[PDB]
Design a protein around this nucleic acid. Sequence first.
RNA 1: GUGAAGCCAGAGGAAACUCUGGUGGAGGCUCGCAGCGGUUCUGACGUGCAAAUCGAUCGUCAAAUCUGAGCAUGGGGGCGAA
RNA 2: UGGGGAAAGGUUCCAUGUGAACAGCGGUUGGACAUGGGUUAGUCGAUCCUAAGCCAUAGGGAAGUUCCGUUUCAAAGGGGCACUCGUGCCCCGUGUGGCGAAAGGGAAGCCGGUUAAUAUUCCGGCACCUGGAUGUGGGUUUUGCGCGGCAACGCAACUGAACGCGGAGACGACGGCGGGGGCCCCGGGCAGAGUUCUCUUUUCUUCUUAACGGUCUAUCACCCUGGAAACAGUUUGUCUGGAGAUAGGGUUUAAUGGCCGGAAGAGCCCGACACUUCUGUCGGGUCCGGUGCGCUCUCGACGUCCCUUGAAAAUCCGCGGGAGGGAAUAAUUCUCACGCCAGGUCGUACUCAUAACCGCAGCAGGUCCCCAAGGUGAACAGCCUCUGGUUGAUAGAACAAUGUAG
Lengths: 80, 24, 91, 48, 112, 252
Amino acid sequence: PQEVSDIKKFIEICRRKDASSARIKKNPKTQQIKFKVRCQRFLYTLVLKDSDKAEKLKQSLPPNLQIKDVPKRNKRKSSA
Amino acid sequence: MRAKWRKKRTRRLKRKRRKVRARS
Amino acid sequence: SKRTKKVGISGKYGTRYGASLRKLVKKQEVTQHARYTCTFCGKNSVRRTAVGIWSCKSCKKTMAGGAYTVSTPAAAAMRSTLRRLREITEA
Amino acid sequence: RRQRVLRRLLVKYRASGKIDKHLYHELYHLAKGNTFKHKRALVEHIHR
Amino acid sequence: PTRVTYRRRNPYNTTSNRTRVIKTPGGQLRVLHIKKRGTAPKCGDCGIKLPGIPALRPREYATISKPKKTVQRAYGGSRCGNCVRDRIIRAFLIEEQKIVKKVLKEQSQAEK
Amino acid sequence: GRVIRNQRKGRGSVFTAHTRLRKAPAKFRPLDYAERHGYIRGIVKEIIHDPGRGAPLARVVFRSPYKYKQITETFIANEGMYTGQFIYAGKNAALTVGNILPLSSVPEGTVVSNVEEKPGDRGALGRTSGNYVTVVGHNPDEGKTRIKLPSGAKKVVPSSSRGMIGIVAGGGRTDKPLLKASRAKHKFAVKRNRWPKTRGVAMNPVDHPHGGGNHQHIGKASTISRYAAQGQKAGLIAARRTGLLRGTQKTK
RNA sequence: GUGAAGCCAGAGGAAACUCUGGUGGAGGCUCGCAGCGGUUCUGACGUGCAAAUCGAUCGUCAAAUCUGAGCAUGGGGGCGAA
RNA sequence: UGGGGAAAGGUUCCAUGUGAACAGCGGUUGGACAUGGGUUAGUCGAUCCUAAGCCAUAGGGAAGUUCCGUUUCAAAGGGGCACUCGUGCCCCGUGUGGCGAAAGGGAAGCCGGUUAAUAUUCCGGCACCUGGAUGUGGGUUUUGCGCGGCAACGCAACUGAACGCGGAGACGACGGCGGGGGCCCCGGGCAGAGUUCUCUUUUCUUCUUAACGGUCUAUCACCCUGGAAACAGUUUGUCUGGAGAUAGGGUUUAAUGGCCGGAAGAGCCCGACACUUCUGUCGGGUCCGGUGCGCUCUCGACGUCCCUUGAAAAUCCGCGGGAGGGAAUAAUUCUCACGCCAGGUCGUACUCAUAACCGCAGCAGGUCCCCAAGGUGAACAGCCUCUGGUUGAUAGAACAAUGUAG
Ligand SMILES: [Mg+2]
Ligand SMILES: [Mg+2]
Ligand SMILES: [Mg+2]
Ligand SMILES: [Mg+2]
Ligand SMILES: [Mg+2]
Ligand SMILES: [Mg+2]
Ligand SMILES: [Mg+2]
Ligand SMILES: [Mg+2]
Ligand SMILES: [Mg+2]
Ligand SMILES: [Mg+2]
Ligand SMILES: [Mg+2]
Ligand SMILES: [Mg+2]
Ligand SMILES: [Mg+2]
Ligand SMILES: [Mg+2]
Ligand SMILES: [Mg+2]
Ligand SMILES: [Mg+2]
Ligand SMILES: [Mg+2]
Ligand SMILES: [Mg+2]
Ligand SMILES: [Mg+2]
Ligand SMILES: [Mg+2]
Ligand SMILES: [Mg+2]
Ligand SMILES: [Mg+2]
Ligand SMILES: [Mg+2]
Ligand SMILES: [Mg+2]
Ligand SMILES: [Mg+2]
Ligand SMILES: [Mg+2]
Ligand SMILES: [Mg+2]
Ligand SMILES: [Mg+2]
Ligand SMILES: [Mg+2]
Ligand SMILES: [Mg+2]
Ligand SMILES: [Mg+2]
Ligand SMILES: [Mg+2]
Ligand SMILES: [Mg+2]
Ligand SMILES: [Mg+2]
Ligand SMILES: [Mg+2]
Ligand SMILES: [Mg+2]
Ligand SMILES: [Mg+2]
Ligand SMILES: [Mg+2]
Ligand SMILES: [Mg+2]
Ligand SMILES: [Mg+2]
Ligand SMILES: [Mg+2]
Ligand SMILES: [Mg+2]
Ligand SMILES: [Mg+2]
Ligand SMILES: [Mg+2]
Ligand SMILES: [Mg+2]
Ligand SMILES: [Mg+2]
Ligand SMILES: [Mg+2]
Ligand SMILES: [Mg+2]
Ligand SMILES: [Zn+2]
Ligand SMILES: [Zn+2]
């Protein structure tokens, strides 16, 4: 995993053939937003301190790849 | 530039030229 | 603050091996641990590595000499006589 | 311990400017010799 | 104060079983095995370690890019540069003395 | 009885020589046209010490007269040699310490070392720390040279033999006593096992000719004949005389 | 625990040299644990735990110290600080 | 008397059941008896290379089973191209076998969970090495094969045939000193637990961050200006300096250092609520400093000792040299970024010992290693305690002689 410094290169990363999926994680305590995209080799992560650009990016990115919201207390397939 | 990598590089070019020969 | 009367460096042997043998070993040991001036660079840093090898710590040159001294009187007299003989004979 | 404390005092004085290098070198060799027992005895020697 | 154990079949401390103690996010103290430490290459003539070149095991040098393994000048590797300056000076002056030595002979010894 | 101790050393099972730490033997270059008619030069790279021997060795690098390559050899270093020296080999080489030139081209009174008994055997005579041989006279017709060996003997050698100027380094190594059991034990250990020494009088009759008895004594003359059966030569062998050397030695 | 060379400072003397306080950390040196060995009680047991063990007391302990695996020497032969 | 290994043992490992025999007494219990089950690997080893050493080949002995011989009195080999097609050519030549290490050299995987019995292998997440195939982005070029800095050198790339030189692999014992990780110790804060006749802002436990990457730094050393005696700098330990010190400014080998991803979504500790089971659910916390001749491992600069100087090979890299090949409308033999496919064979259960090895046996004997808490104390001395592990060696009553030990 490797940081992406700015906003600009995230959309080219997300518009690739091997972008399997993506997810959104929110940290209320630290007021932080994490954007993750999964390629074959790496897991790109983008960190945002503000909240306004998050929705605009969410709708700007292509609709083809799926996006999840990482529910709390992630559990295995077998019942808790 | 060791011989194993040079050997692969020239064989790769050899096939690129055979493909060009069959393309023409 | 001399710590010794006459025994000197060979005091590490305690009271063993006899006075004469300690004197003979001390006389030859004293000249082996000292430092000698280099003949090439001139600095005073040349020390013994092997049984017949001496090397300078500054110019890193290494020279083959005697067992416990850089040069021997026999070898010095032979080099001098050979130089004299050659120069008189051929010049 | 004593050697570092004495040397640290000497370097502090040299850097500040209370003493010069000619006195510094002599005091360094007197500190190397068993001359000064402690910090107060040394500072008294500089004052005198 | 928990004690640790090896994780491989070799039970002896034989300069190839290199270990470190780590604490895991599971709150346990285990052992992690490490390889040996690389050595920096030395100079061909004087014998000192070259600056600007990393120290790795001999196999890892095949995965590193070329500019990271050399320095952009003549005798980039294996020579420090002081030896290169000595080589340049020695070569020029020696050839100059060879020219003057060879030129002297035809006039001073073949004038007859 | 059984086989005595000095007969077992010939089987070469335990009494061999330790040779793991020795890199190469010390020899001259092969005799060639360049060294027979002119001279060649080489650089002295290193002065090294090899185990089991005095007389530190020297590493020399020469060129190749026939091919684009270099050949490494190993000589014995004379006292005064230093790293970076140019050394010369051939018929017309200069007469300085360390040079190698045929034994004919030398005026009387010079000392050499590592002299070949015959031209091309790469050194046979005088190659130990602090020893040398001296030339006595030449015979220009029917070429031959008289030499004097370290032991005092006199010899006649062919005039085409080679020798390298100077005196073997190492000086007076054997002057200070070993003074300690360890230092001697190491010295013999690094070469061949012989450090335990067993007196024949303390032996048993089955083991040694000196045998046992109610007192420690030999029982017979200790001088053994020149022609004796194997297993009997244990003692003073072919002694010409016996006792303390008072006068001068007639043999020369 | 003892404290060999080398080094620093002070004192004496015309000189050659001589004294004092530190620093330094050498020795097949020394007391003493683990390991290795096996002096005395001529102790215990002596159809024993054991076809050589057990307890107290002992020798050495940074060097001729202790030790694992792989290889070599085979019976009038090997190996042996005997 | 804990938690795991090498050699050796070979199912002794787990579950269910049990008449006789064994466990020198008993037995519902067992390492015993009977019936079933259990050992998953491109990354951990073997597989590769050589050491001491062993055995073929050329040759010589011996009536012979066979002995010597390992580069030796030998005609001993391998690299490229084009042809529909192998069958035709062109170069180099001093040399030319195999076996031998689960402790020597060596390409690559970490965390959490899961089973009655296996896991660095199984599941989930995040990576790496080798081999083999191909396309985009960017770079270079009409001056044909890159720019910057005086310099040590720097960057995402940035031609190199035959031959040759060099480095890494690659190495002794001991002594003190400095940096880092882990352990131990002290203070504050948030939770839970123990004691309370009296005292104690009291005593105890949890407070964690892996492989793999990005970014800023850390001894030695090196470069530039300038030219030193009233000599200077300096280590615990006197070495360094016109062969260029002090001073000022820079480059670089070396993270088990700081921050960010991985990563809180994990793990752990409390509380509160349902409630047959199948099932759960919802709230919070998971911090801030100090100290040292402390213990252990690791790194660096010094010093001492030798008539003792402390292995080899496979494999990998740079350079000197200049063979060949290649664009102006595209071509490209770019060690840069991304992208495609594959990685065979065998071992993996358990003990390693006052019961799983060897001693005729469930024998006070023997048998090679790793981890190492608190107090007293100079201390791995002796004595008490915490984690963890046992309570297993035929028993009951009485206290004469003679004994063994104190
Ligand atoms: Mg090559
Ligand atoms: Mg004598
Ligand atoms: Mg004897
Ligand atoms: Mg006897
Ligand atoms: Mg007899
Ligand atoms: Mg007789
Ligand atoms: Mg006698
Ligand atoms: Mg002793
Ligand atoms: Mg014993
Ligand atoms: Mg006993
Ligand atoms: Mg008895
Ligand atoms: Mg009895
Ligand atoms: Mg266990
Ligand atoms: Mg079964
Ligand atoms: Mg019974
Ligand atoms: Mg019964
Ligand atoms: Mg039963
Ligand atoms: Mg029943
Ligand atoms: Mg049962
Ligand atoms: Mg069981
Ligand atoms: Mg059974
Ligand atoms: Mg492996
Ligand atoms: Mg092979
Ligand atoms: Mg054979
Ligand atoms: Mg034959
Ligand atoms: Mg093999
Ligand atoms: Mg290994
Ligand atoms: Mg297992
Ligand atoms: Mg896997
Ligand atoms: Mg090149
Ligand atoms: Mg090794
Ligand atoms: Mg430390
Ligand atoms: Mg982190
Ligand atoms: Mg400076
Ligand atoms: Mg983080
Ligand atoms: Mg949590
Ligand atoms: Mg240790
Ligand atoms: Mg795969
Ligand atoms: Mg065990
Ligand atoms: Mg037992
Ligand atoms: Mg048994
Ligand atoms: Mg204390
Ligand atoms: Mg204790
Ligand atoms: Mg147990
Ligand atoms: Mg019993
Ligand atoms: Mg009873
Ligand atoms: Mg009684
Ligand atoms: Mg009694
Ligand atoms: Zn010098
Ligand atoms: Zn150099």
